Amino acid sequence: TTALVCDNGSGLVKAGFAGDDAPRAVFPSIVGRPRHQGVMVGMGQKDSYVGDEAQSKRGILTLKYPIEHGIITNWDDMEKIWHHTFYNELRVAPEEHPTLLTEAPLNPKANREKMTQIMFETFNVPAMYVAIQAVLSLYASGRTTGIVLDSGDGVTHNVPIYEGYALPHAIMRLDLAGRDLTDYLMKILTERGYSFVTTAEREIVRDIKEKLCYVALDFENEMATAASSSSLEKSYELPDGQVITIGNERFRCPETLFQPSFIGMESAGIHETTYNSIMKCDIDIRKDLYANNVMSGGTTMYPGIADRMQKEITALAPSTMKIKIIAPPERKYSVWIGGSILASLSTFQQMWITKQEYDEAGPSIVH
Amino acid sequence: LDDEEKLDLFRVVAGVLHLGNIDFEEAGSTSGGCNLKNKSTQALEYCAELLGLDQDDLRVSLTTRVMLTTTVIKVPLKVEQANNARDALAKTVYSHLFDHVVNRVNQCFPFETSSYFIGVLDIAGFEYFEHNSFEQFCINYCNEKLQQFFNERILKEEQELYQKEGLGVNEVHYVDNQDCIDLIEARLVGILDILDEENRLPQPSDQHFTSAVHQKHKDHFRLSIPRKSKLAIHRNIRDDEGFIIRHFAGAVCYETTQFVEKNNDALHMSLESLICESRDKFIRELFEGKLSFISVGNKFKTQLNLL
Amino acid sequence: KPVWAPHPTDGFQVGNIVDIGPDSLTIEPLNQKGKTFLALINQVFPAEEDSKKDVEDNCSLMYLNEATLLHNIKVRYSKDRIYTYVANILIAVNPYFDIPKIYSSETIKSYQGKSLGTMPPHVFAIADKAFRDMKVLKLSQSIIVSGESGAGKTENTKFVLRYLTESYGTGQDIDDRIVEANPLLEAFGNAKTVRNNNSSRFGKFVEIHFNEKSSVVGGFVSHYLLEKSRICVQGKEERNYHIFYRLCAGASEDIRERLHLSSPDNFRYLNRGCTRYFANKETDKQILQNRKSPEYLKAGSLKDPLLDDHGDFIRMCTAMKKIGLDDEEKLDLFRVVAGVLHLGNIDFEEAGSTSGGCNLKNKSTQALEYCAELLGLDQDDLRVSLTTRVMLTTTVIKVPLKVEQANNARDALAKTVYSHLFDHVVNRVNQCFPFETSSYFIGVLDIAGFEYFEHNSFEQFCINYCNEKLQQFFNERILKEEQELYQKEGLGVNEVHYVDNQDCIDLIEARLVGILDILDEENRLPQPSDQHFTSAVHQKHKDHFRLSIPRKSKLAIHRNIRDDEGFIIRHFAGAVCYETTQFVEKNNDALHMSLESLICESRDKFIRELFEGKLSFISVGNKFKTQLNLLLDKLRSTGASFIRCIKPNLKMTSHHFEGAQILSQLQCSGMVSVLDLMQGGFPSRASFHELYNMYKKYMPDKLARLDPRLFCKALFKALGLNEIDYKFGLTKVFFRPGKFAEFDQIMKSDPDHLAELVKRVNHWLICSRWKKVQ
């Protein structure tokens, strides 16, 4: 019966039935084979632990996120993600539910085909649809116009939508955030002697990326107040008892979203990709793209955005034009609350691909 | 009814009046969010005194969508959804207040061991006006279901009686109104099955709902467009301003203005954990994750088919 | 021809076939037009031509199947003929009210010595047959009464024992002790289950001994299977044992203050499940206010037609003085039961000096003073016996235990005392009917049948495993032995093989690779796990046809269960999912050597009377497998008799027949399967007295004066039927396939021709008058 909304996060895969409250399953996507010899021999140990159990078994495994820069590593691990999710989280048979899968706005062919095709032949769902995560965040925001900033680990996106059409020539994909923000944070925490070099320990880095980071209002002036003796330094406690004091680097890492020169990539900041996508849209429509700037995803939950984003855009944007940046709480589940609204609406049941027609058609027409 | 309990009944009726005096605006930090107006601070102090709630906990319950990750977060609502939530909270209190008055009266004539019973219905007939809306469509829809009951109890049962008394009489078939029932309340393709789906849609529209009736039922003999009507009044109404349903009692045009607003009866979970959680004993006595918006037209269709 | 159509409410209803095709059998109901549905070939069964007939033996039917057998029982329920012979198996239906004269002593004196089939089926017609086999083949006979709990297996057992101590003489000076003792031992062993309020959680086996002179010499009652786990943990809708609610709702205030007893919610072994008492309106006001727990105050009494906890305490203490139990010894029996309750109130923690060790909680000091006063032990010597592992180097050292092993040791010590207490009560009762020089004996088994619930655990797996071993006994005693009898009576019959359940036996109890051989090895493992035990079943038996995973099941409930939360075993009675939560805990029955040198060493004389280096944990599942295979050796060594008791309704009231639950009791008892193998080469086989009643109505009064042995031999000779199609036996006529239906149309055809053939065979009997006399 009931449809299932499963969002193919790159974080943070999210899963839950069609409405009305919150996702049933959220997990950090990691697959990990055991890197040490067993010695206790027990046995009973699994060939690969998925999350959450692989986050209770850090240091005995080598964690591998299965989706890297929006590309799935292999469908052998992906199928195990799916199987784990449906069976050992949700507790549901795929033949009972038409499913809803998500993708990125711009991703290479045949990554949506091969996925769709394998999931139809392996799990044998009766119907399926694949939605881009940005469109779903507009349904969640309750707007029908605006440029959508969907920023999650490890692919961010910039999609302009106008009532209710999309402009293909203005959609921008940045591979800037968020795993590179994790790797950059790990590179500037080595600068303060905290040797977190290993794959597993990168999850601990991610936890300091969540909790302890903040953003400047202006870089140059926060660098000024950093030179002062004031307490920008916050003390974190580590699982083995160590106390880590980070200060300058604390606001330095998120600023990368406005200056990709910090990471050293040639691409320009969210600031400039916003302006350059807006100034690829037709003259009349630009008026309502301003003030319907909508943020989304988990990596937009740094404290100083959006009012950093606001002040910076307001400096490059035309004078006397009203700019509002829409950023609700809960942005990590924005996409999912989108999907819930979508698959519940009649008549869009008939925009699902059904198994009988798929049997004849195959990967054609999906895209 | 005690005079001290009559004063608490007057506090509930006056609390609905000072609930409607709360006006919203936009803000934020959330940036998208909803806040209240400056003129709604004196009105919120007198409203929370009658209801028996704290002012700060009622201000972030009319303006937010509470959800959980089990922590329990709060997500600010839109301004149109705030105005629909205040109006839905006012209709929710009067619903439980009307059921409380009949429960006080039913307690003055309690019954014990029963078997047979004589019911007495008192409901209005086809009342049509010059300007007809949603409530006149609910009255005429209830009259078409009662008239289909009268066609199977006055005409079908009666001719069964002519064949029970030795009269015999050849069966004469009546003209059914079942086609109107499978227009107004039809599953997936009915008018109430498109009206309740419009409220679930992001950015609802009265022009989109009017065109969806003619797009879904293009050919049905019971349905007509304002320009196909011969009555003059209907000649002033535009295509996206209403639609004509032909009933057994006549052809009635229904305007589509505020139809969607009237079909909104959303009961927000944060307001449920507020009206239940009131500090007043009378309100507690009155009120003694699915489905989002719940449905109003199918709430009434459930109570009509149960009758 | 009409067939039997599956109906949801009635199970089976009458209906014709009006469209036919593969998996498209369109069935129109009879006398209910319109409701024409479709079926499948395996769900439709043919029906009998005559609807007014009811047959004593069901092998006297023409179209034998489950729907024609459920209709014969539905008609004989209406005509009040509850006792019905199906082949060599007695089928009994519980009426739940007293039927006139069927239990009469004039009825019992009538039946005495009469041959089977000559007299109508009755409970005493099975007991008379298994008394003449004592003189024929001279072998001890075991009466095995099966059926779901609350089906009358104990009341019909008291009718069988009353016939044996009356029809074949007396025997015992006092009969009534055997009858009266059963509700006494059911106080200790009965509990409350989801299926039945009054259910027995033990398998009693009466052994009435006799001698070569054929007279009773006394008896011996034992018991097999005790739900020891029930003491420690109970289900939500279940109670514990029914003696604890008869002690807290029955016993006086000069007994409860002397045993320091409080309300059931204070005791750990009684605060898990249901604490409510079984009482009626009058008894509700009789129970004292201090005995009523807050859950009893909120939810009130439990209702049953028979049970009353305060009422059954008066009939418990009356039955104690009738078996000769002294009131001073009854007070020591109450001190042992109360000592198990204050044993469960001991709570452990960690400490130490040992640093790893186990200690007790502060709240367990007042509870330990009252527990050691009832048990008769010192407090300090019991505190370092629940918390240490005593060993020797011969000095004798003590090594503190873990906290989980302390909680398992306290629970194992509580189950150990109730084990020896249950054996002490049956030893006190067996002493009231002692036996002397024996040879022959008649056993009477009383154990429940396939009882499956919505939530199934370890004890439901022990009941279904015991039912699969008993059903493999029924497949080699009802099907194998019976076809040996067809080849002993000159019938011959080609052997038909049955489907064996031996593959389930070598799954549950297989050596090294069995489920109990992995469950008992899990408890020996350091840090046991329920996830490790569930994955070890699927890792060890990956391919077995009897085993399935929760995701491979189609039932919805099972769809909520996760892979590491349970496993599905397919049984002969159906596919049952067993949850793996607390399976390992229930398989723990470790008897620590320090506690053995404490319970034996008690200062109380009653405890001494009760209890009158290998193997570590000892085994619980293989403790019960030893006592189950020992009872199998007593069944394979004795002559068995098969009685099946069918419950007609869940309300337990007279004149109510549900038809859907009764059908499930025919499918969860092997009845359909035994009546498909047995059909073989001679599906219809009817006795001479049954063929006299069914066909005398087509005969005139004058001709009907003949005896049934002569009437059946003159009607067979008059028709001249072929012996290979119609076999004439000693007391029955055996019909080949399609020939009983052809014989019914002989009798329903040409009356003048049949009366002329009766005249011709009468002439032959006048000529064959002297030939037989020499």
Curated annotation (Swiss-Prot), chain A:
Q: Which SUPFAM superfamilies match?
A: Actin-like ATPase domain (SSF53067)
GO biological process annotations for this chain's record?
A: actin filament bundle assembly; actin filament polymerization; mesenchyme migration; positive regulation of gene expression; skeletal muscle fiber development; skeletal muscle thin filament assembly
Modifications made to the protein after synthesis: Oxidation of Met-40 and Met-43 by MICALs (MICAL1, MICAL2 or MICAL3) to form methionine sulfoxide promotes actin filament depolymerization. MICAL1 and MICAL2 produce the (R)-S-oxide form. The (R)-S-oxide form is reverted by MSRB1 and MSRB2, which promotes actin repolymerization. Can be mono-ADP-ribosylated on Arg-173 by SpvB of Salmonella spp. This modification blocks subsequent polymerization and leads to cell death.
Q: Which residues carry this modification: Tele-methylhistidine?
A: H69
User: Which stretches does the entry tag as region Interaction with alpha-actinin?
Assistant: 106-119, 354-366
GO cellular component, alphabetical, reads: actin filament; actin filament bundle; cell body; cytoplasm; filamentous actin; filopodium; lamellipodium; skeletal muscle myofibril
- Gene Ontology terms for molecular function: actin monomer binding; ATP binding; calcium ion binding; calcium-dependent protein binding; cytoskeletal motor activator activity; hydrolase activity; identical protein binding; magnesium ion binding
PROSITE patterns, per the entry:
ACTINS_1, ACTINS_2, ACTINS_ACT_LIKE
Known Gene3D superfamilies for this protein? 3.30.420.40, Actin, Chain A, domain 4
| Record field: catalytic activity | ATP + H2O = ADP + phosphate + H(+)
Mainly localized where?
cytoplasm
Which of the residues bear the PTM ADP-ribosylarginine? R173
Key words, A-Z: Acetylation, ADP-ribosylation, ATP-binding, Cytoplasm, Cytoskeleton, Hydrolase, Methylation, Muscle protein, Nucleotide-binding, Oxidation
Could you tell me which Pfam families the record lists for this protein?
Actin (PF00022)
Q: Where in the cell is it found?
A: Cytoplasm, Cytoskeleton
Entry-annotated residues carrying N6-methyllysine: K80
Q: What SMART domains does this protein map onto?
A: ACTIN (SM00268)
Annotated EC: 3.6.4.-
Instruction: Kindly indicate where the leader peptide sits in this chain.
Output: none
Q: What does this protein do?
A: Actins are highly conserved proteins that are involved in various types of cell motility and are ubiquitously expressed in all eukaryotic cells.
What does the similarity note say? Belongs to the actin family.
Q: Which PANTHER family match?
A: ACTIN (PTHR11937)
What name has this protein been given in UniProt?
Answer: Actin, alpha skeletal muscle
Annotated organism of origin:
Oryctolagus cuniculus (Rabbit)
- Which taxonomic lineage is given here? Eukaryota, Metazoa, Chordata, Craniata, Vertebrata
